């Protein structure tokens, strides 16, 4: 239940993207806790149980949905801001690709 900073949120989206095909459809488990684990251990995140992290993913992911259907034309954005929605883009597209290779075949 723990807030994270808008620097740990990039620093862990950095991590989920760079790892992203190392997510199994249906062991999301494997891939949550690893991501935890290597958070902590390499960018100083606190330590998350497997829940707490998929939580806090799950909380940045509502919040870029929120952001980019506000978005207006002419608005002016940060460079982190930038990187979070382009990694939030990336993740995004590798949870419907799965998405995709389950309902199809």
Known sequence: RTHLSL???????????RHKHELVDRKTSEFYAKIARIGYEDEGLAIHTESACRNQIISIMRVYEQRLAHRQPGM???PE??????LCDEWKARLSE???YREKF
């Open 98 to 100: 799965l998405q995709q």
């Open 7 to 17: 620097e740990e949120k990039i620093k862990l989206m950095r991590l989920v993207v």
């Open 76 to 78: 002016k954005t940060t």
């Open 81 to 86: 801001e930038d990187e979070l929605d382009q």
